[PDB]
Structures are given as structure tokens and as C-alpha cells.
Amino acid sequence: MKVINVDVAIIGTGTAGMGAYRAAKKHTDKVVLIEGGAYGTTCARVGCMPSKLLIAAADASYHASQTDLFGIQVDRISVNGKAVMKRIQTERDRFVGFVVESVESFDEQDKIRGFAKFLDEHTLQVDDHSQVIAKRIVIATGSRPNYPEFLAAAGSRLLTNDNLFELNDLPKSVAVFGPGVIGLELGQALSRLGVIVKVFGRSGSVANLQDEEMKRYAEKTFNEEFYFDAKARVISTIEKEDAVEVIYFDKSGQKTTESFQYVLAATGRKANVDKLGLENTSIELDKKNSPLFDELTLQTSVDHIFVAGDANNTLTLLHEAADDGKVAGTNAGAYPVIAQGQRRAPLSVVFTEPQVASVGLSLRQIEDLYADQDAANYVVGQVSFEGQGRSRVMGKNKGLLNVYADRTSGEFLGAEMFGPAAEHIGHLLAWARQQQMTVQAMLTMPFYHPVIEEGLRTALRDAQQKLAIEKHDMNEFIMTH
């Protein structure tokens, strides 16, 4: 067995891992990247890229059926499932190819093929062929799909993101479990593509939305289009000869048996930290067996072992994994010099229609920091997109936007939005939060006409008029003497 010494070993050649490698190489030449599976990152392979590709097809198909409002009729929209799948697959391959070329450009001696596990706090074994002794180690192993036990009975008809995009044809029908980002994006897209869909979640959850009014509005809006029970009681999902039989109670509590060609487990993903031999370290774990970590430095309780990307089960977003990589890589490279990452303002997006964006502090974080049981030093500004001019012009007038502000200073804290162009409004808001703008300042910014951003102006005015600050600092337009 070959033994190698490195300053930095990075387990996982995904987004976080490749970011960690580039960062760590600026501090030290002695960095290895280990990869047990296919190169290309989860994002380009079976993540962001194919899912967005699926969505683009779905929205082209769906919007073609919604032109009558405008005075146009479209006859026989027909979904060629083989074509839909082929396009997704070929574009997906193209994206993966770019990552593979980057991986290929790295020094051959810096890449080791195989699955790593810890033997002790400085020794990794990769398969049965190599041992790496590393001064510092970065766990960048991502997440995998995961599902409750009952879903396992769907057998060979159980889909995840790992196999959904490899189908040669679109399915006839899919039962989707998991009411979060992936589950709603994929269920809606499939439903828009002529697939018979129902989406079941259990806890009342809708995407990552925290506000109760928002969750209910979104759930009801989705149900105008396809079946979505955020509080479903599901008995079983059992593979038959040609289908999966799903036994569940509907919204009227009526027991229902219904066959679906497939089930999709868009349930909670699992961080890849359970199969890496952590029990051979003193890494402290929470009551769910997730590694505890410093959220600024990415250090576990073992100060020379870091955890980055989906592996730390936090900020499980692509751009965040990339930032995690920079933090873990720099800190692994420069150790024992340790710095804290200055995180970008939180930005989270769901590519449904209408879209969801969450920006800045979440509602729970705001309640924690700006309120208690009996008093609040924050206010909420709101707008409905139903009566918003441009949204109505486009026939997209559905949605709600909540904006949160410090009640004393007017500092913009965060937001939730379910509505059109939420992805873009999310950026606008996220840049405003990172700059620590106040709502009064943001009201002085440009708002064109007629645009969706004007809905944001409405929500900001709503918040502003609730602030403890003087009436006469409520100028939306500044004049100087």
C-alpha cells in the first residue's frame, strides 16, 4: 500500500472540494484531491443543471397552453418525452465536460481515485490501495438523496435526482415525496410536461418558506395547478408489476389507493459523513450524528479537520458550497493561521412558478434576535402581486412579498417572496442586505415603470411607515440646498 504525505487532503472533488483545492494551493503545493465517484460535481451532473433544464422545457410547454388570456389559441401541445430527455441529457453532458476539463488540468499527482475513510485524525485510507497522511483534512463529500423506510418498498420504481435525469422517456405518472426545493421544482416541472403528479409532504412545509401565511398562500397557489398536500398522511408506497401502489388519505381524509409509474424521493438529503469512519476520530457530533462545526471557520472539534459544502448540512446551495470551499481551503492551507469567512448575505431560490426567494435573516432568526414573547424591534412590509400592474400585464399576478426591517433604525433584515422574477428581486434584496441598507435608503433607489420591482417599492413603503423614526426622514427623493 502506497503512503503519501500532504499538508492538505480534500475528500470530495465537487464544488466545495475543487474550490478548497484552488484556495489551499495558494498557501501550499502539497494538496491532494480524492474522488470516489464520477467527476463533474453533483450540480452539473444530477443537480442544478439538469433540474433547471427540465424546468425550462416544462415552462415552455406550460406557457404554450396559457396564451388564451392574451387572445391567442394554441392547438395540440404534444410533449415528445424522448426529445425532452435527450435535450436535458446532452446539455447536461456539455456542462459536466467543462468541469472535467478543469479537473483534467490539475496536476496528476494532486488527484487520487477512490473512496476515502479516516483511520485516525491524520490518516485516510483510499480504497485498499493508498494511505494519505495529512496535516490538515477537508471533508467536502456533499450530500446524497435519502428517504424514510416506507419509500424503500417502491423498489426499482423509486427515483431520485441520481436517476430521474437518465430516463430515456418521460414517465406517465410520478408520486413525489418531499415538499422542499427539489420536490416542488421537479413535481411542478413534470406536471407541466404532461406527467400525472401528486406531491406529498408531511410537516406543513412549503419549500423553505417560514412565514405561515406565505406557506399557506403558496400551497394554495400550487394547488390551482397540480395536487400538493403539505400535510399528507401516507400509508404505503409498494412496488407492483407495472406501477407503485400508493395508499394515502386525501385532503378530505378519504382513504385512497392510486398507482403511479414511479415515486420520486425528494425527501431530506443526507450529508455524506456517515460512511467515512468518523468514529476513528474525536470529532464531536450532534444528537443526529452530524459533525459540529464552527460556521465561520468550518473547523470541526478537531481543529485541523474542516467540513465544507453540503457535507456540513448547512447553506446547502451551490454558491455557498463554493464559498465553503474558499473558507475551508484557505484555512486548511494557512493552518494554524485561522480566519473567519465573511459570508455573503443569505440568498435562497426555488425555481417554481411563481418562484420563491429568501434573503438575509430568516423569520426565525429575526424573531430570535429582534423580538421576544412580549415585544418586537422589527416590522414587516408587505405587498400582494395579484394587484401589481406589470405582473397583471404579463398574467403572472400571483404572489406575496414580506420585507423585514429593524423598527428603530430601519435597517433591512431579510425577506420572503413567492412571486414572478423572485430570483432577480432576490439578488436586488441580497445586495441591499450585504451593504446594510435601510428601507428608507432603498426607497431612494431607482424603480422603473412598469416593472415587478415596483411591488418591492410597495412592500418597502409599508415597512417604512411602521418605523419608530421621524415622519420627516421619510423622503423617497432627496433634495439638497
Ligand X SMILES: Cc1cc2nc3c(=O)[nH]c(=O)nc-3n(C[C@H](O)[C@H](O)[C@H](O)COP(=O)(O)OP(=O)(O)OC[C@H]3O[C@@H](n4cnc5c(N)ncnc54)[C@H](O)[C@@H]3O)c2cc1C
Q: Under rule CB under 8 A, which residues in 187-226 are in contact with a copy of itself?
A: none
By C-beta, is 136 or 157 nearer to a copy of itself? 136
**438: Cα within 13 Å, side-chain hemisphere:** 17
Task: For the segment 384-423, give every residue that binds a copy of itself (CB under 8 A).
Answer: 389-390, 392-395, 421, 423
Q: Which does 411 bind (CB under 5 to 8 A by kind): ligand X, a copy of itself, Na ion, none?
A: none
Interface stretch with ligand X, choices 166-174, 298-306, 313-321, 421-429 (CB under 6 A):
313-321
Annotated binding residue at 454?
Answer: no
Among 113, 135, 216, 424, binds a copy of itself (CB under 8 A): 424
**Distance of alpha carbon 188 from alpha carbon 284, whole angstroms:** 40
According to DSSP, the residues that pair with 414 across neighbouring strands are 360, 404
Q: Which does 160 bind (CB under 5 to 8 A by kind): ligand X, Na ion, a copy of itself, none?
A: none
Contact yes or no for 31/135 (Cβ under 8 A): no
**Distance of alpha carbon 225 from alpha carbon 214, whole angstroms:** 17
Query: Counting contacts by CB under 8 A, is residue 445 touching a copy of itself?
Result: yes
Label residues 31-62 b or e (16+ Cβ within 10 Å = b).
Answer: bbbbbbeebbbbbbbbbbbbbebbbebbbebb
449 is catalytic: yes
Task: For the segment 348-407, give every residue that binds ligand X (CB under 6 A).
Answer: none
CA–chain centroid gap for 204, Å, is 18
The sign of the torsion formed by the CA atoms of 469, 472, 476, 481 equals negative
**Distance of alpha carbon 123 from alpha carbon 361, whole angstroms:** 39
Contact yes or no for 150/232 (Cβ under 8 A): no
Among 195, 327, 413, 459, binds a copy of itself (CB under 8 A): 327
Provide CB contacts within 8 A for 29, sequence distance 6+.
Answer: none
Contact yes or no for 240/257 (Cβ under 8 A): no
Annotated binding residue at 180?
Answer: yes
Query: Counting contacts by CB under 8 A, is residue 25 touching a copy of itself?
Result: no
The 3-state DSSP class for residue 416 equals strand
Give least dist CB 249 to a copy of itself, A.
35
Query: Counting contacts by CB under 8 A, is residue 28 touching a copy of itself?
Result: no
Query: Counting contacts by CB under 5 A, is residue 146 touching Na ion?
Result: no
With CB under 8 A as the rule, give the number of residues binding a copy of itself: 86
Give me the catalytic one of 63, 304, 449, 472. Answer: 449
| Cell triple for 25 | 494551493
Task: For the segment 4-23, give every residue that binds a copy of itself (CB under 8 A).
Answer: none
Among 18, 49, 137, 366, binds a copy of itself (CB under 8 A): 49
Among 267, 272, 438, 458, binds ligand X (CB under 6 A): 272
By C-beta, is 9 or 317 nearer to Na ion? 317
Interface stretch with ligand X, choices 207-215, 219-227, 316-324, 468-476 (CB under 6 A):
316-324
Q: Which residue has the cell 496528476?
A: 108
Query: Counting contacts by CB under 8 A, is residue 330 touching a copy of itself?
Result: yes
Query: Counting contacts by CB under 8 A, is residue 254 touching a copy of itself?
Result: no
Task: For the segment 311-330, give every residue that binds Na ion (CB under 5 A).
Answer: 312, 314-315, 324
Provide CB contacts within 8 A for 84, sequence distance 6+.
Answer: 54, 57, 170, 193
**Distance of alpha carbon 476 from alpha carbon 342, whole angstroms:** 31
Contact yes or no for 467/407 (Cβ under 8 A): yes
Residues placed in the known binding site for NAD(+): 178-185, 268
Positions annotated as catalytic residues are: 449
Contact residues: Na ion, CB under 5 A: 312, 314-315, 324
